[PDB]
Amino acid sequence: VETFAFQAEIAQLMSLIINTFYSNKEIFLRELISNSSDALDKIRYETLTDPSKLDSGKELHINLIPNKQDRTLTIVDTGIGMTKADLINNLGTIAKSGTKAFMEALQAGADISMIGQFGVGFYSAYLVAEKVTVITKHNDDEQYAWESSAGGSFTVRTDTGEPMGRGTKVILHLKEDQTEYLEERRIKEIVKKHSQFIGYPITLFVE
């Protein structure tokens, strides 16, 4: 297991999301589904010129899986997936400028719900999760497990769990007072309100 430190700017963003009083937490879902949609659009586009890129799975969809026993809400997509390089450097590099812009916008009057317009919506997951685990598999890389409870660091390890073929699984270990996001009617409500026109099937599993 490798332990890495977030760039100061991203750690700052995460603490703001965790510390700022902001009731409209449900927007975290739209941000994650949006990321999944972008990842699906990407593998889709790439397969138009290299069909073999779908040998790891032709289905392009999103699964939303709640589990009360483990108190988790998992967002699963069969998108392009992330490389180890994305996990350690690429994503953080891009998020740096997005965070700055977002920060400046906030002090200018914007609010947390607009985080997605700055390209760093992923971190909104910390509005409802005490810990986030990301299992991902990109075509020319191994399957990895990324994890972070914020606090300034994250870990990456080669994942030996059940292989997923291709895609990303964001596991949200929900905070004790945010279990409403495990309820089918609540998830259904949120998807209908903020993600009704996603161009991929979104299946809401039931417990």
Ligand SMILES: Cc1cc(C#Cc2ccccc2CNn2ccoc2=O)nc(N)n1
């Ligand atoms: C390929 C792909 C990418 C994403 C994403 C993202 C994204 C976009 C902007 C800033 C930070 C991130 C993610 N950062 N993450 C997620 C695990 O390790 C990280 O550093 N989400 C999905 N579902 N699929």
